Ligand binder design. Structure first.
Ligand SMILES: CCO[C@H]1O[C@H](CO)[C@@H](O)[C@H](O)[C@H]1O
Ligand SMILES: [Ca+2]
Lengths: 702, 706
């Protein structure tokens, strides 16, 4: 049932370290690889920078003819000699704080204007930002592939070379995330028009959905600027769908080119999203890959985990990310393509004793493999670093292969993983709680994000009060998921799109965090789920609109729900918990015919009900809470207990986090202390001391 | 010449604890006070909530007639019986996570619309946010003062009562900041129009400064929306100056009302600005008090310190805040009106082992007094909690008066303070580095802030490239001040406004982080500083404009500088350090005349020079760096060493922070480990080494006699 990497027909914990040959003295390449191997790591990972090897147009150096660190062939041979598999990442973009994000200077100087990403006025966004589907860009990329891919092909495991996986490009769409700016290159906009014509067929159909007044598709302009009208919201929503298709078109062109060289190894991509040590934005980035993940079961997405520290401040981020990736990519192992080792930023410290606990928490939280990024520090050759001379700090090895504090922590964790991997990889958590992932709430990287300074989405201007980003970040990510993890309740996430009703019936509860909009398919799915016997928890709104904000009241009608939206005090009472602070003055006040009122405004109006519908159960809360008080944990705890869901253990100290992972034969209990306090506690099924910011793992035979 | 509190002609370290009588069972008030006193605390501090005591309009209960915890009179009497002095804080605002920020429900229901703070459209910003100078608001505030101030007056120290200090209102302007919006109430707009007429006298004089074409003062409207023209920037700048006068008018009215009751105790106010465990925006909030601190030498401002954790992520916030308060308020002790104890937010943990280190680091960083907030947890009675029933978590005492983990941390810190206060309060650090505080760069809370929704200031649209908020946050607060603390170089901060030259002359170096604009007074001051023998470090720009962005080339001319602004790679070389990453493509390129070139662009163009001018030294860097790489600390270290400034200690681990505080009698060495690593190191005085092991996120204090 578990998904995991495999070696010699047995479960294999992928342990890789990132070592950038192009940033290390070649005299020390062997020493880096030997020290990596000696930690118990089985794989080494690097970019192959296009700028580094195509030194001028049509002049390629893979053998160290012009600089000894351009000897890619020697580095591959060393990986084989030192019994390490190799992950290669030839771009064309690598980012990696490399000048021009890895693109050659000669390419960027030569490209015509129409090869660049352009703003709505036709101006170049950045001198290093190409348009992904530019003919000229793809032509040069293809010429780079024609030289590097025969080398990669020749050194695959299949040919007793070390190469086992390859990454296509790097964080596709990342530049639109960081800036909040879309590419308005006329070629992109022409592909958007085709997408829209393809989707709606006729201008009449588009006009009926958008409430627009176009006489033809010729009137249609790409959305830009702030959303003022529901028709702007519609146009922006489809612009987001378009970019998901556009990224799939791009990765598909790279993939087919790569396969033409007989490269049959596993292909990968990588998901960014961590900011200042939390990852509440990373699900937005996962959502940009929805079309790739639907159309390429054979490309494995891995996570970029950048916790920076390890405490209760960010304890929930890595589990929520790992669970959401599992939801969106069920047939591949959850792995960290970039797994924090040292720090990209000198002023942002990465302590060995923090990251050691992160590595163990990552096991508790279901990771099946990872690539220490960066295992080895680098020195940028001759000014090629976007920033300073040095690449990463407080790594396992410095650029000269000196061992640093993190080295012994990685060796310790790796020793544990190798000892346990056969059993640990085959373990799962028993989740009786399912939490819905409704991707359209996440489709906002161009209009609402933590990195977008000037917000283009202001839902009050559209006659709405529940912002999808506030809902997904504060109510879902930092609220419900943080609360369940804090309370030591297992949850799974499920992608509600094309979701199998049968998979939902495993669970005792399905939690849906709902805004005022939800498409007909999902409203019908949730109707069927309850009617057939499911227990649904739905807040803060019964939705009444579809994704285009047109009337859609299927769930409301199927459930016999009537409500008025009314202003009251932020505080409500729910299930006899007084003074529950809620996010909004506006709440849904429910008719309680055939219902049991279970939440009340300061004036005692009914803002929550329970109801039997068919064979199932509905709990509807007309108010938004996350986790910003002890009453919020008390409410989550009461809701879970409505369907008699129990934690696996009684642990005497409620601030100890635990995860029970088991299979038929084996149980692992992971105890995690996310607090600056030496804690002593006892546990039983439903007396140990753990240092601050530390862990303990117990094995039980069943 | 340290500033410290004095009790009975001796240095006294003010140790207060916050205990909310209105949130504690009155049967347990005495136990809270006794347990606070047994920590060595000398004072207790509390709000007196208007909403709690004026239970309906003109219905006052201070005696526990309608609820036992309304018995203020009994709480005051218990403070005196348990030998604690009392700080009282009657508002009208208290915030305190109390419903409606402490304002009565009946008042907010009753007030007409023109009592409230309004957006430019004329809509109520928030149903609990009044306009400070609303006539209606002040009429009711005065009726509340008429009832609470006689009680406060009767129980003052001079009448053998326990009351030694009183706070006026609470964090003035904290809602113009957190709401994310400016107050356009017509009382405010009409005071602004008066302020402008008084400032400029004639529409022609205003038009000459703004470059506007108004026919009369009646054509001038309060600025709103984004800054697109330099005239919009000028209007907003004066609007910032006006708000500083407005807050001074508000506090002045409260103070004059208070003094009429025969209240002669020390008056206080409290500075907000921490959020998410950093205080990089606090200097903006303290700048909003510039006119209060000039007009009211008798009102002592204290800091509201909310670190939440204690690590290298926020190590520099408290010291930079303490230094900036000292710059703005040099004639009073640096103290924390609210000094984090426990957590206001259940989900934001406060560990005893973090806060204990914070307390010792605060001592190293020059704090002279503090009020643990919250010493005692409270339970909100009668639904009065803004956000839930429980007020604070992980405090020294729970609401029931049980000791929690933090109680022994506070006892330990207080015991050290009581043993050492006589010498410790008199100790100074030897600062050879002075950093200039140029208040106008901070005057942006209406146009550019971490909290403001709409970014209204885009300097590129004004033909500028150095944003004042970017400069003061990243180049100064997170950059230079962070860098100096990390490198263990002592610095002082000086307010450049009406700054005496003779105060600056004791320093080996003056550091000025400059934008393209600087007033003529400051350009002249820095000119005289160097000509008379001062050593000036100036970056990232020689300014060429004044506060209204009109030509002012005084400092450029006085220093015989010629430059052109040119685009190049972010990377420069400086003092032989290669690949120094700088914030801007644009750099100042200097003529090499009568100077040594010490920084170069990727095209080897000169972007920094050193020269001798009169008796003084000038170092100009035409590029912007904070602390975002190791090259940045190397560069700060090189600049400090130009004048042979030395650290007080050789320490074998560069990641250990230390402060040496000394007087004639005594030397204290504070070691601070802001890192999750057990560190073993050795040290010695710059003029046999001692070995020390320090736990993660911990401290050591060594006392030397002589
Ligand atoms: C208005 C509430 O003010 C609170 O929260 C602010 C943000 O963290 C702090 O800066 C203030 O000191 C605190 O009083
Ligand atoms: Ca009904």
């Amino acid at each position: 049932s578990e998904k995991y990497f495999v070696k010699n027909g047995q479960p294999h914990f992928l342990i890789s370290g990132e070592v950038h040959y192009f940033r290390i003295n070649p005299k020390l390449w062997r020493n880096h690889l030997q020290l990596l191997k000696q930690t118990g790591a089985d794989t080494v990972s690097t970019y192959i920078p296009w700028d580094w090897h195509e030194i001028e147009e049509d002049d390629f150096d893979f053998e160290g003819k012009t600089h000894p660190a351009r000897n890619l062939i020697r580095f591959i041979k060393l990986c084989k000699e030192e019994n390490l598999d190799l992950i290669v990442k030839p771009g064309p973009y690598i980012l990696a704080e490399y000048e021009n994000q890895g693109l050659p200077s000669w390419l960027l100087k030569k490209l015509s204007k129409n090869a660049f990403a352009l703003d709505e006025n036709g101006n170049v966004i950045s001198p290093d930002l190409v348009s992904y589907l530019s003919d000229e860009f793809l032509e040069y990329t293809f010429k780079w592939y024609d030289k590097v891919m025969p080398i990669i092909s020749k050194h695959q495991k299949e040919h007793y070379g070390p190469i086992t996986m390859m990454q296509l490009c790097n964080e596709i769409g990342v530049f639109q995330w960081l800036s909040g700016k879309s590419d308005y290159n006329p070629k992109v906009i022409n592909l958007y028009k085709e997408f829209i014509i393809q989707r709606y067929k006729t201008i009449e159909k588009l006009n009926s959905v958008y409430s627009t007044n176009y006489n033809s598709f010729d009137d249609l302009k790409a959305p830009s600027g702030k959303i003022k009208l529901r028709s702007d919201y519609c146009a922006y929503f489809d612009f987001h769908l378009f970019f998901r298709e556009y990224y799939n078109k791009y990765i598909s062109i790279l993939k087919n080119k790569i396969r033409s060289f007989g490269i049959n190894i596993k292909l990968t991509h990588n998901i960014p999203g961590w900011i200042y040590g939390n990852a509440s934005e990373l699900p937005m980035l996962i959502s940009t890959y929805s079309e790739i993940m639907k159309n390429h079961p054979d490309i494995i997405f891995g996570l970029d985990h950048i916790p920076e520290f390890v405490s209760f401040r960010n304890a929930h981020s890595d589990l929520a990310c790992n669970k959401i990736l599992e939801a969106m990519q069920p047939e591949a192992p959850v792995w960290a393509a970039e797994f924090q080792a040292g720090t990209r930023e000198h002023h942002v410290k990465a302590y060995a004793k923090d990251l050691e606990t992160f590595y163990i928490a990552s096991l508790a939280h279901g990771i099946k493999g990872f690539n220490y990024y960066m295992f080895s520090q680098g020195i940028n050759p001759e000014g090629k670093g976007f920033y300073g001379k040095t690449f990463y700090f407080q790594t396992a090895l410095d650029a000269a292969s000196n061992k640093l504090a993190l080295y012994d922590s990685i060796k310790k964790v790796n020793r544990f993983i190798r000892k346990e991997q056969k059993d640990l990889l085959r373990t799962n958590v028993n989740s009786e709680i399912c939490v819905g992932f409704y991707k359209p709430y996440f489709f906002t990287e161009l209009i609402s994000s933590q990195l977008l300074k000037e917000k283009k989405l202001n839902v009050e201007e559209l006659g709405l009060y529940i912002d999808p980003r506030f809902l997904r970040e504060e109510i879902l990510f930092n609220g419900l998921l943080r609360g369940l993890q804090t309370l030591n309740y297992n949850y799974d996430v499920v992608d509600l799109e094309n979701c199998d009703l049968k998979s939902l019936t495993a669970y005792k509860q399905l939690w849906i965090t709902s805004a005022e909009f939800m498409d007909a398919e999902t409203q019908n799915l949730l109707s069927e789920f309850v009617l057939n016997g499911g227990n649904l928890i739905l807040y803060p709104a019964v939705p009444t609109l579809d994704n285009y904000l047109n009337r859609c009241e299927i769930l409301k009608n199927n459930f016999g729900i009537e409500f008025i939206t009314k202003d009251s005090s932020h505080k409500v009472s729910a299930f006899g918990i007084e003074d529950v602070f809620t996010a909004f003055s506006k709440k849904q006040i429910y008719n309680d015919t055939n219902s049991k009122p279970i939440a009340f405004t300061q004036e005692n109006e009914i803002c929550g009900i329970r109801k039997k519908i068919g064979k199932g159960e509905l709990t509807i809360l007309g108010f938004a809470f996350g986790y910003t008080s002890d009453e919020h944990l008390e409410l989550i705890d009461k809701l879970v207990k409505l369907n008699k869901i129990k934690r696996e253990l009684f642990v005497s100290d409620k601030d100890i986090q635990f995860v029970v992972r088991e299979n038929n034969k084996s149980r692992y209990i992971f105890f995690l202390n996310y607090h600056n306090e030496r804690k002593t506690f006892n546990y039983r099924k439903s007396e140990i001391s753990i240092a601050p910011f530390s862990y303990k793992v117990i094995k039980e035979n069943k």
